[PDB]
Amino acid sequence: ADDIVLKAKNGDVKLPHKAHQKAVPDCKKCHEKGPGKIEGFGKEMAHGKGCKGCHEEMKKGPTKCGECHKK
Ligand code: HEC
Ligand code: HEC
Numbered sequence: 001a002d003d004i005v006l007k008a009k010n011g012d013v014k015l016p017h018k019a020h021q022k023a024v025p026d027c028k029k030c031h032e033k034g035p036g037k038i039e040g041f042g043k044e045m046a047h048g049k050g051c052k053g054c055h056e057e058m059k060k061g062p063t064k065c066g067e068c069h070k071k
């Protein structure tokens with residue numbers, strides 16, 4: 001399957017799966033979540049544990065605006 005881009009108005013956000021599969025062997029951080037995770041995602045989650053927060057906790061991955069968002 002293909003990578004997805006989130007159409008944030010300030011700039012597209014790429015989500016490269018290959019890097020995540022390699023760097024996050026605990027697949028259940030994202031997969032086999034209960035129902036509601038597709039509807040639930042948004043800016044609050046993205047800027048929290050959905051994206052940025054995991055990067056902070058794992059000590060790796062982008063944490064600056066322009067590292068995630070790109071027109
Ligand atoms: C969130 C940050 C994820 C982590 C950590 C892992 N996966 Fe993932 N996966 C995630 C998304 C948002 C998607 C759909 C978009 C995409 O890039 O495909 C997927 C997709 C898969 C797939 C289908 C891949 C394909 O057909 O090309 C598989 C088989 C899969 N994910 C498995 C998987 C495993 C085994 C992981 C841990 C090592 C893993 N994923 C991490 C989100 C995230
Ligand atoms: C842990 C549970 C994570 C979640 C949820 C998300 N990301 Fe992530 N990401 C994670 C790690 C440990 C890393 C480092 C990977 C590396 O090899 O350096 C990353 C990396 C990225 C990257 C950069 C990939 C690269 O080629 O360097 C991007 C662009 C990125 N992450 C974006 C991103 C987004 C948009 C997420 C939410 C939708 C997201 N990540 C979730 C760990 C985790």
Ligand code: HEC
Pocket residue numbers: 006007008009010013041042043044046047051052055062063064065066067068069
């Ligand atoms: C990745 C780890 C990110 C970092 C660092 C920052 N942002 Fe972000 N942002 C990210 C995603 C995946 C999303 C989309 C949420 C979704 O609905 O899918 C966003 C969202 C925004 C928005 C809202 C965009 C919209 O609703 O169209 C804004 C205005 C925004 N982000 C700005 C922003 C700034 C200023 C940042 C640095 C302070 C920043 N983001 C960091 C992913 C990530």
Ligand SMILES: C[C@H](CCC(=O)O)[C@H]1CC[C@H]2[C@@H]3CC[C@@H]4C[C@H](O)CC[C@]4(C)[C@H]3C[C@H](O)[C@]12C
Pocket residue numbers: 004006015029030031033037038039040041042045049050051
């Ligand atoms: C559920 C995990 C981990 C975050 C958490 O613990 O809640 C999060 C991390 C990244 C999230 C995905 C990012 C891309 C997509 C954004 C859509 O708007 C909703 C579906 C997708 C496919 C999201 C589904 C789910 O919300 C994920 C996989």
